C-alpha cells in the first residue's frame, strides 16, 4: 500500500487557493467503511475523514471554513485537500495520511510568497 503525491513542493501566492493532491490505490469500488483520510500541518488537524464521516469539532480553528476534502475525488483514489485564501500562516509541511487496506503518508512542503 502506497500513498503518492504528484507535487511535493508548492510555491503559492498570498490570497491564492491551493489544491494538494494525495493519491492512493483503489482497484475496486471505494469501500467507505475501510477508509480513513487525515490531513494536518504542524500539529493542526485539517481533515479527519473516518469511514465516510467527519467531526467538525476536530478541525483546527485556523482552517475552519477554509479547508475541505474534495470527496468526489476519493472514488478515483485522490484525497485532495483544497485550501481557500492562503496566508503566511499556511506555509509549512502538510501531511496526508491514508489508511485503506494498509497505511501510508506523504509530506508536502508549502511555501507562501507574499
Amino acid at each position: 500500500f502506497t500513498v503518492t503525491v504528484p507535487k511535493d513542493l508548492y510555491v503559492v501566492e498570498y490570497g491564492s487557493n491551493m489544491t494538494i493532491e494525495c493519491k492512493f490505490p483503489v482497484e475496486k469500488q471505494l469501500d467507505l467503511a475501510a477508509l480513513i483520510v487525515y490531513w494536518e500541518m504542524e500539529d493542526k488537524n485539517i481533515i479527519q475523514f473516518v469511514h465516510g464521516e467527519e467531526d467538525l469539532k476536530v478541525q483546527h480553528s485556523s482552517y475552519r471554513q477554509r479547508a475541505r476534502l474534495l470527496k468526489d475525488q476519493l472514488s478515483l483514489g485522490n484525497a485532495a485537500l483544497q485550501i481557500t485564501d492562503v496566508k503566511l500562516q499556511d506555509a509549512g509541511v502538510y501531511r496526508c495520511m491514508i489508511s485503506y487496506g494498509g497505511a501510508d503518508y506523504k509530506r508536502i512542503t508549502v511555501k507562501v510568497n507574499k
Binding site: I36, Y38, E40, Q48, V50, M97, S99, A103, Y105
Partner: protein, 58 residues
C-alpha cells in the same frame, strides 16, 4: 535512517487519529496499521507509540 524516520512519523499520526476518533472500528484499523509498522521496522519508538495506542482501544 530516513525510512525509519518516516515510519516513526506515520506511527505518531496513527496515534493522533486514534486519540481523536470516536469509532472503535477506526481505532482497531489504525492499531492494525501500527502493528503492521512494528512488524516491519522492529523499532523501539514505533513500539512505544503502539503501547500508548493500545491504551485507547477500549
Amino acid at each position: 535512517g530516513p525510512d525509519r524516520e518516516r515510519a516513526r512519523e506515520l506511527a505518531r499520526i496513527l496515534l493522533k487519529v486514534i486519540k481523536l476518533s470516536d469509532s472503535p472500528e477506526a481505532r482497531r484499523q489504525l492499531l492494525r496499521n501500527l502493528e503492521e509498522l512494528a512488524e516491519k521496522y522492529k523499532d523501539p519508538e514505533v513500539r512505544r507509540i503502539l503501547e500508548e495506542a493500545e491504551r485507547y482501544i477500549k
